[PDB]
């Protein structure tokens, strides 16, 4: 009797709004341009599935269309906020060691999880053995870098799809976005780009968690009286 | 009961179908969010193929009209001994200052190319700019 | 009257620079490993330059320096490869320190 109203007022209400957490106010094409998100790899490194998201090549250096990035980034942040609102487990994954420390701290600050280390065979596809039969896997995996250190796709991208886990991923011009659920074309190398990504996801996740508590508290006070 | 066939459809299509068939008793936590706010492209595995014959990537080289002026300025006067400051978003180099004056004089009706380039150098020298010809 | 991406790209210093070969740029040292200086100069990738023999101690974290760029990204395609190999760093020559 009271559960249907709970799930309707708390879990189903956010899904009726186009931007329930107002993540569009977090970034702009200018803010992305200042972080050098449009800078891609050289044309010789281009992945063919990233061609839709490329504005052009400026002297053999690919330029990422930030108008598309802005639309993809809006969707990725929107999905991430909703999953944080629903109390999903969000796992950040990246093998770029220049940013391992930054990413691990961002996860701890937002109350989420980070995996920046060597990814051992079967963390996801054999989790019950490695962790235990009652282990809960992540509900969302966010890749700040989708390639490993030999310039191949991170194994967790394939394994996340196997386990039916949605993936958000920054995909540079040499990356493969086919299996990434919510790809965001953008520069994954420059510290200014990577720092921006961490602020946006950190803020989206923190905002969604605060929104969940506000709604719950209001729903209880009104329930008693 | 589920499906690890990551190359068969997408996590959404595989999940939606197994929910209908009753194989999955409950929907995953992410399913309702994906449904309301789906990605622009459904994430379906694809095998990247190599181009052959007369197939070429659609990416186009980015050029501007002023690039012709920049190529000539670098050839005639070389790169300025002044250093580029790519951190300042409003930085103007000697070449950019040359290009802006070159554009101003073109809008005043001058149409010759060799004449429109010599008058621009004089204007900057009058303004105190150092233009050392390479040769 | 919201600026478009095409406008940002057209008027960006990196776009206005043209080719990067033999271009003097100002870089900033952000990381140092022994005598290896990691210098950002506004591009996608940093460059790594060895500490100069003269006035080596003047090069510290945050020190702004003058560079002569050679390549924004060191990449090459090797025989039997479908793509290009990249070392994920720019090629530049450290000239000295920038002072006011």
């Amino acid at each position: 009797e009271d559960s249907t109203d709970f799930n309707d007022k708390i879990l189903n209400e956010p899904l009726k709004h186009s931007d329930f957490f107002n993540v569009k106010e977090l970034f702009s094409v200018r803010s992305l341009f200042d972080a050098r998100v449009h800078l891609g790899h050289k044309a010789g490194c281009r992945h063919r599935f990233m061609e839709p998201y490329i504005f052009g090549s400026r002297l053999d250096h690919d330029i990422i269309d930030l108008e598309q990035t802005a639309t993809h980034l809006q969707l990725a942040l929107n999905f991430t906020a909703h999953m944080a609102y629903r109390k999903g487990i969000i796992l950040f994954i990246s093998r770029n060691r220049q940013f391992s420390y930054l990413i691990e701290n961002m996860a701890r600050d937002c109350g989420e999880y980070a995996h920046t280390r060597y990814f051992r065979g079967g963390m996801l596809t054999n989790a019950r053995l490695l962790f235990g039969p009652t282990v809960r896997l992540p509900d969302l995996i966010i890749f700040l870098h989708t390639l490993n250190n030999i310039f191949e796709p991170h194994v967790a991208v394939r394994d996340a799809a196997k386990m039916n886990i949605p993936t958000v991923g920054i995909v540079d011009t040499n990356c493969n976005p086919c299996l990434i659920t919510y790809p965001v074309p953008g520069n994954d190398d420059s510290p200014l780009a990577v720092h921006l990504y961490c602020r946006l996801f950190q803020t989206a996740i923190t905002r969604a968690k605060e929104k969940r508590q506000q709604v719950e508290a209001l729903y209880r006070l009104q329930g008693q009286k | 009961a589920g499906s690890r066939l990551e190359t068969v459809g997408s996590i959404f299509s595989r999940t939606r179908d197994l929910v209908r068939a009753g194989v999955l008793k409950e929907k995953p936590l992410w399913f309702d969010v994906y449904d309301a706010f789906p990605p622009l492209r459904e994430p379906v595995f694809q095998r990247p193929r190599v181009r052959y014959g007369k197939a070429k990537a659609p990416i186009q080289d980015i050029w501007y009209h002023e690039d012709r002026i920049r190529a000539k300025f670098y050839s005639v006067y070389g790169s300025g001994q002044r250093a580029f400051d790519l951190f300042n978003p409003n930085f103007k180099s000697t070449c950019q200052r040359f290009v802006e004056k070159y554009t101003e004089l073109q809008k005043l009706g001058e149409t010759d190319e060799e004449k429109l380039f010599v008058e621009t150098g004089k204007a900057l020298l009058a303004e105190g700019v150092i233009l050392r010809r390479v040769g | 009257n919201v600026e478009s991406f095409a406008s940002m790209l057209r008027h960006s210093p990196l776009t206005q620079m043209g080719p990067a070969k033999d271009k003097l740029v100002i870089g900033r040292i952000f990381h140092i490993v022994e005598n290896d200086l990691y210098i950002d100069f506004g591009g996608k990738f940093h460059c790594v330059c060895r500490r100069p023999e003269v006035d080596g101690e003047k090069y510290q974290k945050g020190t702004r320096v003058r560079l002569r760029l050679l390549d924004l990204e060191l990449t090459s395609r090797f025989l039997g490869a479908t793509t290009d190999t990249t070392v994920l760093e720019a090629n530049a020559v450290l000239l000295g320190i920038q002072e006011s």
Binding site: - | Q60, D61, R68, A71 | R10, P19
Partner: peptide
């Protein structure tokens, strides 16, 4: 449409091809 969009043309910064020491000599 938009004035700042890229325009199609040939590389203005392209360098000439290399030449041997005897290129152009009998």
């Amino acid at each position: 449409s938009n004035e700042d969009l890229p325009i199609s043309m040939e590389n203005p910064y392209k360098e000439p091809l290399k030449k041997c020491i005897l290129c152009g000599k009998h």
